[PDB]
Amino acid sequence: SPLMDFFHSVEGRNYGELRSLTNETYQISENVRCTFLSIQSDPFAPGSQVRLVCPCTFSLEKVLQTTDLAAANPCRRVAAEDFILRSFHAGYRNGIPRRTSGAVQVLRPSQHVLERSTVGLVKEIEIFARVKLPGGRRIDGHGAIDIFYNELVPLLEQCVVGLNEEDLHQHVICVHDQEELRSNLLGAGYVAFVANGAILPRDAGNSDKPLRDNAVPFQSPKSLECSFTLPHSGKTITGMGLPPGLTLIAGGGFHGKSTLLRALEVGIYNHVPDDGRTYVVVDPTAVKIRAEDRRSVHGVDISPFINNLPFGKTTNFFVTADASGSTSQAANIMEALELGSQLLLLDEDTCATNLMYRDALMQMLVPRAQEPITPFVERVADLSQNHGVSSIMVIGGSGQYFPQARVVLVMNAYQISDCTKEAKEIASNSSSVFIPDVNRCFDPDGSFTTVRTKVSGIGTESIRFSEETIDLSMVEQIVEEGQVNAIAQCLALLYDGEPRIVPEMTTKGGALTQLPSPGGVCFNSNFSSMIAGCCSHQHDKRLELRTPSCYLPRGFTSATRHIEIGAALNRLRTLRTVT
Amino acid sequence: SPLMDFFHSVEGRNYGELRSLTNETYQISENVRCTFLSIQSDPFAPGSQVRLVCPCTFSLEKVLQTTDLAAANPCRRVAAEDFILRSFHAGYRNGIPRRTSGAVQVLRPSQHVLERSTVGLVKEIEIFARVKLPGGRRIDGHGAIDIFYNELVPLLEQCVVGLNEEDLHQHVICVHDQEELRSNLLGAGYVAFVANGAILPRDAGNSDKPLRDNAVPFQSPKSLECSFTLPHSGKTITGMGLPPGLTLIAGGGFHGKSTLLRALEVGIYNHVPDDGRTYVVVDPTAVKIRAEDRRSVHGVDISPFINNLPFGKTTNFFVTADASGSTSQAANIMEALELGSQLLLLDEDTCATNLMYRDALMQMLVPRAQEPITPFVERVADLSQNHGVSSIMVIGGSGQYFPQARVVLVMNAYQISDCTKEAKEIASNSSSVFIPDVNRCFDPDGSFTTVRTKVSGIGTESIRFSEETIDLSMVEQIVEEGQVNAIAQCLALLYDGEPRIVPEMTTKGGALTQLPSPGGVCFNSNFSSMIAGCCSHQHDKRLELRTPSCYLPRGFTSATRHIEIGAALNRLRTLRTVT
Ligand SMILES: Nc1ncnc2c1ncn2[C@@H]1O[C@H](COP(=O)(O)OP(=O)(O)O)[C@@H](O)[C@H]1O
Ligand SMILES: Nc1ncnc2c1ncn2[C@@H]1O[C@H](COP(=O)(O)OP(=O)(O)O)[C@@H](O)[C@H]1O
Ligand SMILES: [Hg+2]
Ligand SMILES: [Hg+2]
Ligand SMILES: [Hg+2]
Ligand SMILES: [Hg+2]
Ligand SMILES: [Hg+2]
Ligand SMILES: [Hg+2]
Ligand SMILES: [Hg+2]
Ligand SMILES: [Hg+2]
Ligand SMILES: [Hg+2]
Ligand SMILES: [Hg+2]
Ligand SMILES: [Hg+2]
Ligand SMILES: [Hg+2]
Ligand SMILES: [Hg+2]
Ligand SMILES: [Hg+2]
Ligand SMILES: [Hg+2]
Ligand SMILES: [Hg+2]
Ligand SMILES: [Mg+2]
Ligand SMILES: [Mg+2]
């Protein structure tokens, strides 16, 4: 009642009158209370931060297993929080609100189940939102009363207090078994697993939802079939297990190779049970590797792939403002290695192919003396045998990886086939360099000298760091705005505590054995250890970092790997590195 | 005086009081008058549209050649307007304004000289801007008086009335000789020309300015050297002329191949005289061709490259919501052909390489029966001999195009070399399908049925069409926001006059012999003829189209080819096509 009474008594008064709200709590329903955290300056501006809280109506026993929240599996807690968020949003599609304003901004999840600051299960369910308070320049009492009483209150009462305890419990189970399966891949002796009956294709070019119509379910070649009995559902699933080493994915155009590789890329994530890619997992450290022309690089050793540059330019400590296709990809590989990646994913179409192979005709035209590039084909075995680093590759034009392949697959009309033997036969009927101990200090002094601040995430595509744009359009395993919001935050903290935080983070990271994953479960350099500290700390700090440089509201952050954090900083154009 | 007096007498009064401005003209200086066109609703909103006018202080005789503006060469008029705009902006860097607010928004040009609605030479110089009128919710009289009196007035008086008549005249000459050279390429028997002494490289990965330091000037191989005496400067320049047919650009990594191809891509444009790429020209219809995964296609015949798709899917009238690498590239090629392109530019790194070639080992694994893709290598000669369509290609991995090549170039440390003979030798020491008469009606009925409007350009990267995002991030010859603003406008007009405009445009386009180029100088289907009408009309209408669906201010539009207009519509996901 009170809040409505309030919005009544201010119905016409001046907008600044709203400031009285700040920090206050209002029962707008029996089950729904509403704290204001912040109040907007004008109606035009970014809305007031709000926190809404309602209670567990489901049983911590059935759903979380443990009696009290602290003792619960963080993976189930995260999956639950991901369910509640989805329910909330679905509530709009089912027209639950008596009135729909569009003044509410709550983070929208992806197909993936991530830890986010948006929905919290506390010791009691809290949701963080921005509400654009209605108001010509005086308060709209009734505009606002609708938002809270006839949009939010019912929404929460219904799709949240009123959530389906059974639906939730099955959501948590599916998410948990996915995590089980991925975190058992290594032990079981695999590098990837594609579950039979999976629906790999998406519904459109700009969709991440499964194909509705005529999707051809994935079926494992009989020779690669694996089984895993999931602990929580108790169900036993079969699929294709890929062993350590080099896997080739071959086949004609439009036969699904890239569609399969994509599912693999995002196999470091758990999905919504009906995503179609559930139980399609890969090594948690898997990195999509691609050419990235024109990107900048600082202090990366790519001499395993590139030597003898024009004018004797160092590849041992490579530094450009304008990468080519081959040196950007080699830089990506070497940065992936430093950040901990044990599995490389490649797709011929986005590869700098001159990096990949060179036929004999070409070597005649352009002899190795004229050619800085050492092909990947001559290094892939080095990486795998000496360093435990596997590769999966979609290939078209060339078959000269057949010899190195441990698995060669052929795709015909979306069907997978094991053609390893035939591959090897064709190979006969025809015709360490890496060092785990990388040398790199991030140089905060050099990197930050031009900073005039503001650090903000821009969609999924970039970070605005002062007068600098960090381009993430080709860091392709970034999946949610919240992740970018996450990256933009250590950056701001990395900068705001400029002197003490870098040595702190770098020391922190050297110590660690386990890094937190995006689903919440918990080769070296100064740089990577720092990065490993960048977000060990951010995860302890529960994903949000209040610093003078950060202007992000509460509840718009999503977990990301340390690999992606390092990904962003590697691509900062002011970046300076040292020894 | 008056306007200041005005902004004084309203200094504290309510913001709505500003509406009195609208449509009024104010002499804020002897040489500078200022019409308001529009006034913002609130201070927060997008600013008031303003038009400022000052006079020719330079001589139409020396600069434009003709006595009166109407009779002047549109290319010189456009170049002049491009100079004045640049001068205006430079005025900020040289701190000309006594006060710099940041409330002024004028379109910023690129390195390229384009026709724009921003600066107009009329029969008298007019500039179109948005000014964010300062104002808590009441007018800022002094905030505003600064903007006009101490920022704009001096700016225009100084870098515009006070422009360097000699600098301008040399700008116009350079631009005109560039246009002369490109529009004489065909006649002279070439397809591209790279002027000796050109500075191809850019200064950074995210810059379009020439490299400052240690740039290695382009030098033509002696065997390809051409000369052209420019009519207006009277200067004679030399460089590399590329003949019709297939040119290969080969060479090691980091040797400048992509840097050269890029200069070629944008060689359909005129640049600022000190750009470094001036007199680096190609066929005006040149199109960069690349893979574009996941894009949508409707009604394109790609059967020259793709046949036998899974489940008997038509390639004769190809239609997906999710293109693969090979079918999107083939679709790009076929769309380019339909839109009139006589010159194809390709770069191995962004190619779907399985489209490009397949080695023998691969054909053993995956026989043609399993392979929908017919390689480009088997079609390039068809295109060139039968249809006059040339190709220039950066290639790395494979040398199987050597046989078809008419010119093979090798790049070593940024030096170009003619290795055609040696290429051919290696080729020996080893080992029509297109139909000009394309069948396609745009179907306005099918395409527009989901439109709930608003059409707006988003940077250089996309168009927002109702609840649809047209993705242009890989239409790579788009160079200015204004071009996107241009495309977004026929779309809105195409839609707003839904019934009568499509048959009108399509008829208009069938009639035409000459299409206007971005610098202002003036294979078939229903679709392309429509497109050729889309912007014959937009150019007559002087680039701006007032329709209920368009909310773009005056003076933020830039010319684009019809090819790019068609480029955008081909990529609309609701697009429906017919016969
Ligand atoms: N298993 C599948 N079932 C149904 N459709 C699929 C399947 N895999 C891919 N597709 C669809 O067919 C198209 C071709 O797939 P893609 O993997 O891109 O081919 P390529 O082998 O060239 O990578 C895609 O646009 C996708 O939407
Ligand atoms: N003529 C030149 N003079 C000086 N630097 C150049 C020149 N051409 C290219 N570069 C620089 O060297 C790098 C390699 O050029 P690029 O064309 O990308 O190599 P690639 O042959 O692999 O395409 C680019 O980042 C560019 O900035
Ligand atoms: Hg709640
Ligand atoms: Hg877990
Ligand atoms: Hg499941
Ligand atoms: Hg398995
Ligand atoms: Hg590859
Ligand atoms: Hg086989
Ligand atoms: Hg983290
Ligand atoms: Hg923050
Ligand atoms: Hg002027
Ligand atoms: Hg001209
Ligand atoms: Hg010039
Ligand atoms: Hg020439
Ligand atoms: Hg190519
Ligand atoms: Hg040569
Ligand atoms: Hg046009
Ligand atoms: Hg308009
Ligand atoms: Mg492929
Ligand atoms: Mg290249």
Numbering used by the authors:
A (entry chain A), B (entry chain A): 52 to 174, 185 to 196, 198 to 493, 505 to 525, 533 to 602, 609 to 665
Per the authors:
Hence, to gain insight into its function at the molecular level, we determined its crystal structure by single wavelength anomalous diffraction (SAD). The structure was refined to final Rwork/Rfree values of 20.4%/26.2% to 2.6 Å resolution. Although the full length protein was crystallized, N-terminal residues 1–51 were not visible. The MRB1590 structure revealed the presence of an expansive dimer that buries 2373 Å2 of subunit surface from solvent. MRB1590 dimerization is mediated primarily by residues located in the central and C-domains of the protein and juxtaposes the two N-domains of the dimer together, creating a pore or cleft between them. In fact, although no nucleotide was added to MRB1590 prior to crystallization, electron density for an ADP molecule was found in this central domain. As noted, although no nucleotide was provided in the crystallization setups, an ADP molecule was found in the structure. These data suggest that MRB1590 function is likely tied to adenine nucleotide binding. In fact, there are direct contacts between residues in the N-domains in the closed state. Specifically, the two-fold related Phe95 side chains stack together as do the side chains of Arg199. In addition, the Arg199 side chains make hydrogen bonds to Asn65’.
